[PDB]
């Protein structure tokens, strides 16, 4: 047998926003988060914009003295699991702690430390080379830091599956809790990949929009005018927790997470299948998971990246799982609004798929002004659409073909 | 309901052997793999030796084409995974490919690779970043390669907890089979984080040891004289395989996998608890999940760093885990030959763990010549000591106060 999970707090920093609900307002309204990135030297670069954050206060969270021992990625890990513990009531104690774990991840990790430490090495040797670089750069220490800064002695790990990354963490420490390891979880991912590194790594594989004109426009899943991915930062963080556990202290109880779906897709190390195949068996597999029937489904967050493969293998992929069933559903991108956050785009989008549920409304997909061949769903097009949503899916599909799925259902 | 793992295939590199057997030989013999470092000039370092892999050939497992496209560490990834499969003697098939997946793990993951890129990037401009960059760094890939390479079709993910990776990542695989989420999972980890942010990093840390005229002596757990860890380079994989599965296929089993425990030290970033209370938890929720009485423990494959706090630290744990029988069982450090391969020590760990179960043989712990205030166990100074072993522990304690502990036990 399994024990039930359901999300009792959420956290986020977004492109839209420096909590969770200024975020969903932003998805609501169609709003974009990207923008030139600033205070960065990107002449010599194809690509020039992204999803940053916005107005960060670290200072809310860390003193200043340990904020600087860690890079921005483990900065915003931090800031979106706080929020999602205090949003979750929840009270640590000497009866509950060693019950309460966190799995918090990162798809590229430290990046801005790397470069900086770099500069440093390069320029003057070794010896000028932070006595906190490893600590304060490896994906973990999201993990460990929030893990000794409210004394948390449950499972501590981290995922990085890339592009996959919060998906996993989430539905792994929902595994956690369901097979008696835990009952209760901080899971979901954060990410910091706007350096050099990150724009520089990700434009020489020609991956990224180079719409520099038009940022706001350059993010446009299914549109037959995309031209790749928009690079975003931020993080996402759900407290998870046993159904009993959350009943029995009183919690607000947002949804319930009844699906986890994982595959390889064993075709490509960064393209997927033109038709989604393993995309596909990730969604069966999360609906098996769930007990449920392709037609139950209601409201799919899409992974939508905006690149021209990935998106036409998606339609693919649910055309194949939903049959008469596929245009029923609402299928959107918020990626077309905040861009895509890699390993904290899983985080942040189980977030807006459990705020579907909450609200009962379709976020849209902004920039689909000419549906591409074939992409003839149910997209959301332009604006947030009103509709019954009892069960959602958030899908991830990143690099060497790993394929997440999250289902989340109405709890009453 | 839980289905029993047991270890069909191996797989490794390490600064004693190009594969298990030669590792092993080394093993036994007390011979260390630490030597100056030769790949890049170390004078402006406080360390400039480490356990590096002498003489890999990446052309028994890939093209040359391929692996230029790819960081060491997914090179070292990828010839103990295709070493492990083929010993487990496993056919990849249309009727299994979806029941087979993989869970290789990296503490740091491609550093030399992102170095190599940043200096292009300050040295030269963004247009000199290789467009392998993030494929060929992210640490995800090894997981994402072996899957293209083999086909393997199930749960396909990659942990990343620093010196506790190799461990977490064998024992969540373990759970992926034992929960039905797979039949089979390739799982370890790989490292080469031996470029200079790397030995530059953790010499600002003072981590290290400086015995720079006396490599083979500088690793030398439970010694007074032990002044920081050596850096060393490799991968270990394993074939788990569910129990009926590997019966009904004729597989030699090594030995079974009965326990995995896990917990957080919620103490330090970096610096373990001199009283071992996390060491402690983790090894008891292990002996628990196997329904062990603590004294059938024959073997511990301790995590045994050479560092001054973290080695007292494990003698504390075991004798506060095993009272009495703390003195009955072997305990040692495979690290005194190997140094710490961080993110791949459990996984090489785990390796030695098994075959000192198959040989009915407790590694020597080298240099432990004069053991420090209250290292009064058998530590197995110097000389590999033949006995009976029934069942033995591997634990890893890393970064982020993060512990992992398994359990192997012989199979009949
Ligand atoms: C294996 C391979 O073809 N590497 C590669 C490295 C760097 C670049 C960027 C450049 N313009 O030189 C392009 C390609």
Same mark, same amino acid.
């Given at each position: 047998s399994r024990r039930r999970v359901v999300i009792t707090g959420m956290g986020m920093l977004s492109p839209l926003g420096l909590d969770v609900p200024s975020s969903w307002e932003g998805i609501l309204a169609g709003r974009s988060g990207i923008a030139p990135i600033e205070?960065?030297? /990107?002449? &010599?670069?194809?690509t020039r914009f992204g999803g940053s954050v916005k107005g960060f206060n670290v200072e809310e969270y860390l003193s200043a003295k340990e904020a600087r021992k860690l890079d921005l990625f483990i900065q915003y890990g931090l800031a979106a699991s706080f929020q999602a513990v205090r949003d979750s009531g929840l009270e640590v104690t000497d009866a509950n702690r060693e019950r309460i774990g966190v799995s918090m991840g990162s798809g590229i990790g430290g990046l801005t430390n790397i470069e900086n430490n770099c500069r440093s090495l390069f320029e003057? =040797?070794?010896?000028?080379?932070?006595?906190?670089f490893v600590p304060g750069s490896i994906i973990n220490m999201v993990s460990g830091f929030l893990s000794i800064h409210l004394g948390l002695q449950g499972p501590n790990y981290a995922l990085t599956t890339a592009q996959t990354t919060g998906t996993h963490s989430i539905g792994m420490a929902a595994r956690n809790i369901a097979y008696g390891e835990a009952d209760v979880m901080v899971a979901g991912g954060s990410e910091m990949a706007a350096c050099g590194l990150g724009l520089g790594g990700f434009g020489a594989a020609r991956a990224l929009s180079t719409r520099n004109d038009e940022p706001t426009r350059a993010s446009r899943p299914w549109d037959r005018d995309r031209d790749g991915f928009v690079l975003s930062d931020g993080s996402g963080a759900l407290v998870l927790e046993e159904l009993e556990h959350a009943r029995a202290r009183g919690a607000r109880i947002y &949804?319930? /997470? @009844?699906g986890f779906g994982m595959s390889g897709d064993a075709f490509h190390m960064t393209a997927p299948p033109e038709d989604g195949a393993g995309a596909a068996r990730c969604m069966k597999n999360a609906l098996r998971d769930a007990g449920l029937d392709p037609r139950q489904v209601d409201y799919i967050n899409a992974? =939508? #990246?905006? #690149?021209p493969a990935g998106d036409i293998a998606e339609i693919a992929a649910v055309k194949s799982v939903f049959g008469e069933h596929a245009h029923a559903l609402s299928m959107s991108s918020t990626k077309s609004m905040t861009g895509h956050l890699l390993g904290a785009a899983g985080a942040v989008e189980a977030i807006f798929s459990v705020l579907a549920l909450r609200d009962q409304v379709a976020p849209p997909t902004i920039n689909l002004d000419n549906p591409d061949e =074939?992409?003839? /769903?149910? /997209? @959301?097009?332009?604006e947030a659409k009103p509709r019954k949503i009892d069960v959602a899916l958030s899908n991830s599909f990143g690099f060497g073909g790993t394929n997440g799925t999250l289902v989340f259902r109405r709890f009453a």
């Amino acid at each position: 047998s399994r024990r039930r999970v359901v999300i009792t707090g959420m956290g986020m920093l977004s492109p839209l926003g420096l909590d969770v609900p200024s975020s969903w307002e932003g998805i609501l309204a169609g709003r974009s988060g990207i923008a030139p990135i600033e205070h960065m030297d /990107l002449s &010599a670069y194809s690509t020039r914009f992204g999803g940053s954050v916005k107005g960060f206060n670290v200072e809310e969270y860390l003193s200043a003295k340990e904020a600087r021992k860690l890079d921005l990625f483990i900065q915003y890990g931090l800031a979106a699991s706080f929020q999602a513990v205090r949003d979750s009531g929840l009270e640590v104690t000497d009866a509950n702690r060693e019950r309460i774990g966190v799995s918090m991840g990162s798809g590229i990790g430290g990046l801005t430390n790397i470069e900086n430490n770099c500069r440093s090495l390069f320029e003057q =040797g070794p010896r000028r080379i932070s006595p906190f670089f490893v600590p304060g750069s490896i994906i973990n220490m999201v993990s460990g830091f929030l893990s000794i800064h409210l004394g948390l002695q449950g499972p501590n790990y981290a995922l990085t599956t890339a592009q996959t990354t919060g998906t996993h963490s989430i539905g792994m420490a929902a595994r956690n809790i369901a097979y008696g390891e835990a009952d209760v979880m901080v899971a979901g991912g954060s990410e910091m990949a706007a350096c050099g590194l990150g724009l520089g790594g990700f434009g020489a594989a020609r991956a990224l929009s180079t719409r520099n004109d038009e940022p706001t426009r350059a993010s446009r899943p299914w549109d037959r005018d995309r031209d790749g991915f928009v690079l975003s930062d931020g993080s996402g963080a759900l407290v998870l927790e046993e159904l009993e556990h959350a009943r029995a202290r009183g919690a607000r109880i947002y &949804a319930e /997470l @009844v699906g986890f779906g994982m595959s390889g897709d064993a075709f490509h190390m960064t393209a997927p299948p033109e038709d989604g195949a393993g995309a596909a068996r990730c969604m069966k597999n999360a609906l098996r998971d769930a007990g449920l029937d392709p037609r139950q489904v209601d409201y799919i967050n899409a992974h =939508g #990246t905006s #690149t021209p493969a990935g998106d036409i293998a998606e339609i693919a992929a649910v055309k194949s799982v939903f049959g008469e069933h596929a245009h029923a559903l609402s299928m959107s991108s918020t990626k077309s609004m905040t861009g895509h956050l890699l390993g904290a785009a899983g985080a942040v989008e189980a977030i807006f798929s459990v705020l579907a549920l909450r609200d009962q409304v379709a976020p849209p997909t902004i920039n689909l002004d000419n549906p591409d061949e =074939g992409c003839d /769903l149910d /997209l @959301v097009a332009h604006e947030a659409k009103p509709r019954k949503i009892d069960v959602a899916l958030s899908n991830s599909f990143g690099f060497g073909g790993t394929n997440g799925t999250l289902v989340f259902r109405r709890f009453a």
